[PDB]
Design a protein around this nucleic acid. Structure first.
Lengths: 380, 96
RNA sequence: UCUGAUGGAGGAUCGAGUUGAUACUGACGUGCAAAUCGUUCAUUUCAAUCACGUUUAGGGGCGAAAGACUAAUCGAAAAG
RNA sequence: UUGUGUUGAAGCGAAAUACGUGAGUUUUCGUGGAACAUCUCCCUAGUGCAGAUCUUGGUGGAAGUAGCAACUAUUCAAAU
RNA sequence: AGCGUACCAACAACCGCAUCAGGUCUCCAAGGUUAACAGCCUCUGGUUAAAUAGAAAAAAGUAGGUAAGGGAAGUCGGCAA
RNA sequence: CUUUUUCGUGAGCUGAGCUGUGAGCUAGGCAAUAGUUCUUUAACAACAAAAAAGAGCACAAACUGUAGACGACUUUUUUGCCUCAGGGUGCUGUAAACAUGAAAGUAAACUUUACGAUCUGUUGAGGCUUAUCCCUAGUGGUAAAGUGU
């Protein structure tokens, strides 16, 4: 018979199977739809999760109970050292999907890039990408002309530079960033110009821009159905334990349905979250990356004492409004929105007044070590 | 054959273990560390070192122990581990 | 008649032990165990508890009475 | 009644250009090491098994699985 | 005069099919705190043994702790705490 | 197969001569035979031998902890990593010792000597701080090379 009382099901069936992700790197399922009018541009980037802080900003929402007050917002810091563009891939449309015509490489690729091709780079003799980089410019241009002739989707292979980060991992993270923009010829030329140089975050994104983040959630091993699906605990009197689903199906069908919550892996899932706004693109060069016009204090983003479990952000970075899936040191893919957003929130110009850099270990009371020593005075 | 003086941070080796296993875990860690460092499989702990590790009961061993590892020739090689009484541990590094 | 002591009565009270067994309808339920384990609980000067000895034997015994118990066997034991 | 056996009987394992429609019969090779048939006719019975939660004995899959959990706790060195 | 006189008395020597967390009568009886032969710790005596160990340490179980704000709305019932 | 020869393609030579090849023209003389059929052994792909010509990794190990029941996964293996130390950042809350120092008061000598919870100074001290914190071309170390292709 029917349920006495209705209530919605536990968890979403759209994120099944809740199995471990194939890879650690976030992977774009689909790039934003190409608009032929816009000039050619990159659509994606990759950084590493450094940590989180909070900022103070002035709201500009008329009719909102906040409006003219200064509110505190949680922000995630993503260390975005420039990538290197190393290759070009052309895709053509076939009834069986996208088919690669060819991928052409740059003349020089870093050992950081070549490391990704090895499980034991240290004891190998690093012969990868050694004799295929001496191809003549004639055949390179032939392949490029064929790509321009027949391909409809252009992507640029680019790789991160983990040496610029505090990461222990040395092999770079490689992906392909789809070039959205003008004609095929314009895309080809756009990527050919910067076929070997650095790609900073500033070229890909702008401040106050809404983006999407693709990354693998924090892992938790096997978790019970209570913590994995949110099912209700059984009463205290339950004979064989209470942390389980009581009925895992009706008598018929004489099977367990795939919609029934069970124990299993929790976390380490691939998630693509939409609409994280960029609050600031901090530059490696400047000494006041964490300063504001209402702060005028000379300070950088890294909190007093380092980013816990991460290190120090010595490179370009971006300050993302809100939270982002993954642990510290996790590679995080940033993607342009599938269609440009025109909402008030997406179009707003954030003007932050203060960026916190107190210690995130313990309860820090100082923004700078100079301030701490000034307050305490001389010691033993 | 060689002699080293090292400090072992026993706190980070017994950090996760239960109350009733901290001192034996510290002993096991000391043996394993000395064996790894000396590249020998047969390592003998001095009874005075055992006494020092157990001096405060199973519940807590010293956070750090300053210790002397000596290699001797009698498969053929082996190592002796000896406690070193120190008034402090600050500024005390590994030396060969 | 009242007040203060003294005195030390009672199938008086609390409570370990002993003797039991209220609840968790806990554990266990291919047990440590054909009735145990944990916590909780009842009981302790009396109709109290224990030992050994001794008496009552099967349509019989014994029963502060549940058809209870009478050698893991009881609305008629066990053996042939 | 008339036969086979140490130049290898019964039994058993695998079989067969074998016979039978079939219960079976008959052969071969191996193993075995001492008995065996009689279909000439007949007499006799404790005479034919897939089952009976059959009886006794042996052996499986389960499975290198459940498990080897009360009693706070072990360590260093030596001897044998 | 004759007979008994070793040893266990459960913790593996008894009865529970066993080297079974059960059962099984008596006597002696230290110190501290305390009302106390209670609980907790200690001296003499005894032991460091348990049908196993090592590592890891998630789910789940079991035996527990602690929880903001609310305070029986839970549940047959304040069961359990 | 021989001869008369014509027109198309390939080698080597220099738009071009020759040789091979394919398709032809004239003339000539030369063969098939297994007893009546038993699939008409006829295709394709592969393989072996012999001749002739040219043509690197992964696992394990140690490390890591973005991972984890075990596998698996993320890493590093000499500008790295592990270790200890120094520094930072925090947590707790002012260590031991010493003081003709204090201390409610007390007792014992002919104004000092003893006892004293506690307090003060040296002392925001001391201890701890990655084991899953941060920084350091700071110390010491970084081990046999075993397996598969």
């Amino acid at each position: 018979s029917h349920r006495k009382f209705e209530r919605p099901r536990h968890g979403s069936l759209g994120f099944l199977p809740r199995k471990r992700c194939k890879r650690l790197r976030g992977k774009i399922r689909s790039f934003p739809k190409d608009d032929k009018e816009k000039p050619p541009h990159f659509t994606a980037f990759m950084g590493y999760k450094a940590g989180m802080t909070h900022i103070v900003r002035e709201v500009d929402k008329p009719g909102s109970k906040l409006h003219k007050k200064e509110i505190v917002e949680a922000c995630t810091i993503i260390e975005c050292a420039p990538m290197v563009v190393v290759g070009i891939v052309g895709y053509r449309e076939t009834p069986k999907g996208l088919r690669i015509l060819s991928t052409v490489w740059a003349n020089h690729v870093s050992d950081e890039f070549r490391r990704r091709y090895y499980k034991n780079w240290y004891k190998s003799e690093k012969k990868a990408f050694t004799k295929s980089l001496n191809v003549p410019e004639a055949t390179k241009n032939c392949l490029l002309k064929r790509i321009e002739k027949y391909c409809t989707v252009l992507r640029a292979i680019c790789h991160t530079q983990p040496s610029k980060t505090p990461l222990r991992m040395k092999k770079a993270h490689i992906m392909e960033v789809q070039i959205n923009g003008g004609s095929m010829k314009e895309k080809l030329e756009f990527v050919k110009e910067m076929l070997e140089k650095n790609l900073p975050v500033s070229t890909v994104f702008n401040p106050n821009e809404m983006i999407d983040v693709i990354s693998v959630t924090k892992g938790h091993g096997t978790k019970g159905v209570v913590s994995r699906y949110g099912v209700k605990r059984l009463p205290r009197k339950t004979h064989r334990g209470l942390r389980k689903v009581a009925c895992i199906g009706a008598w018929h069908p004489a099977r367990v349905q795939f919609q029934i919550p069970r124990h299993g892996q929790k976390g380490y899932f691939h998630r693509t979250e939409r609409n994280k706004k960029i609050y600031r693109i901090g530059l490696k060069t400047d000494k006041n990356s964490a300063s504001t016009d209402a702060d005028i204090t000379e300070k950088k983003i890294t909190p007093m004492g380092g980013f816990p479990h991460y290190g120090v952000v010595n490179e370009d970075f971006l300050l993302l409004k809100g939270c982002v899936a993954g642990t510290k040191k996790r590679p995080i893919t940033l993607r342009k929105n599938i269609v440009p957003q025109v909402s008030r929130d997406a179009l707003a110009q954030v003007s932050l007044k203060f960026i916190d850099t107190s210690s995130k270990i313990g309860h820090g009371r100082f923004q700078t070590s100079e301030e701490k020593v000034k307050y305490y005075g001389p010691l033993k | 054959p060689v002699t080293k003086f090292i400090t072992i941070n026993l706190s980070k080796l017994t950090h996760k273990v239960c109350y009733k296993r901290k001192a034996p875990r510290a002993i096991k860690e000391i043996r394993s560390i000395a064996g790894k460092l000396m590249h020998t499989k047969d390592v003998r702990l001095d009874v005075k070192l055992n006494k020092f590790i157990w001096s405060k009961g199973v519940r807590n061993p010293p956070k750090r122990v300053r210790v002397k590892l000596e290699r001797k020739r009698n498969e053929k090689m082996y190592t002796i581990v000896e406690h070193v009484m120190v008034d402090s541990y600050k500024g005390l590094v590994n030396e060969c």
